[PDB]
Structures are given as structure tokens and as C-alpha cells.
């Protein structure tokens, strides 16, 4: 897993103006890439993830390819912890899935959790807490845990 900055946990997309100067800064000392100029790939994620490794190479010509497929890595993880939360908690939305994920600082296990409680935490008409205990009893068995609950409506 890619170690990000808690500043820069959000997904690319949501990465505003800031961000991606902070992700530039970050890739330059962490990667030991040639000093990239702020004035450089100055806009936000969307203006970022819309630009081809050419262009890219042109703001940067001696760390375009390297930035580009870091933003190539950075969102093929994305996907595929949007895809870990889908598998295990059926129905969720891709949007559903993204929500989640930033709500625990892209944590997938914490993701999963969460949204299963969520959905017991109706049921059990008690405490999050409650709705935590019991998921972690049946060992995060939506549907053990939710006939323990209906025994007690
Ligand atoms: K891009
Ligand atoms: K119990
Ligand atoms: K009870």
C-alpha cells in the first residue's frame, strides 16, 4: 500500500488545487525525483487525472513518466480497495463503496466494518457500540449477527 500522507488520503479525483501540490512535493522527496515547479501542473485532481504521460512529460520533462505512473499506481489501488469493500458487503454502490472508504481514511477492513454496522445498527435499535459487538462476535457475519438481534427485537 502505497504510504500516502494523511493529507493526501482523499482519492485523486477529490484532490483540490492545494492537494496536488502537496502530492508533487511528496512524490519529489519520497521518490528522489528531479525538483518539480509548483507553477507546473497547477490546478486541481480533475485537471491532474485528465492529463496524458505527454503532457505530463511536458510540464516535467525530467519527472513526467516517473509522476504520471505514480498517479498510475495510486489510482489502480483506489480501485481496488472500492472493489475489496464491494465484495464483501453486497449492494453497495461504486460512490457507496468511495464514501466509505474516505469516511476511514482509506482503510478497506475499516470500510467494511463500518458499513456492516451500519446496516445492523437498524436493526439492533441500540448502540453503535452494541451493533460493533455483536458484528465482531459472529466475526463480522452480517447475518448470524442479525438473527442474534431479531431474538431480541
Ligand atoms: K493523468
Ligand atoms: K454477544
Ligand atoms: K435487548
Not at 480501485?79 to 475489496?84: L, T, V
Request: hydrophobic share 40%; net charge negative.
Amino acid at each position: 500500500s502505497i504510504r500516502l500522507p494523511a493529507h493526501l488520503r482523499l482519492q485523486p479525483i477529490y484532490w483540490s488545487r492545494d492537494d496536488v501540490a502537496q502530492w508533487l512535493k511528496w512524490a519529489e522527496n519520497e521518490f528522489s525525483l528531479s525538483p518539480i515547479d509548483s507553477n507546473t501542473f497547477e490546478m486541481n485532481g480533475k485537471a491532474l487525472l485528465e492529463l496524458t504521460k505527454e503532457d505530463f512529460r511536458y510540464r516535467s520533462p525530467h519527472s513526467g513518466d516517473e509522476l504520471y505512473e505514480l498517479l498510475q499506481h495510486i489510482l489502480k489501488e483506489v480501485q481496488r480497495k472500492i472493489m475489496e469493500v464491494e465484495l464483501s458487503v453486497h449492494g453497495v454502490t461504486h460512490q457507496e463503496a468511495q464514501t466509505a472508504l474516505g469516511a476511514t481514511g482509506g482503510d478497506v477492513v475499516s470500510a467494511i466494518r463500518n458499513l456492516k454496522v451500519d446496516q445492523l445498527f437498524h436493526l439492533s435499535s441500540r448502540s453503535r457500540a452494541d451493533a460493533w459487538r455483536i458484528l465482531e462476535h459472529y466475526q463480522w457475519d452480517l447475518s448470524a449477527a442479525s438473527r442474534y438481534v431479531l431474538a431480541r427485537p
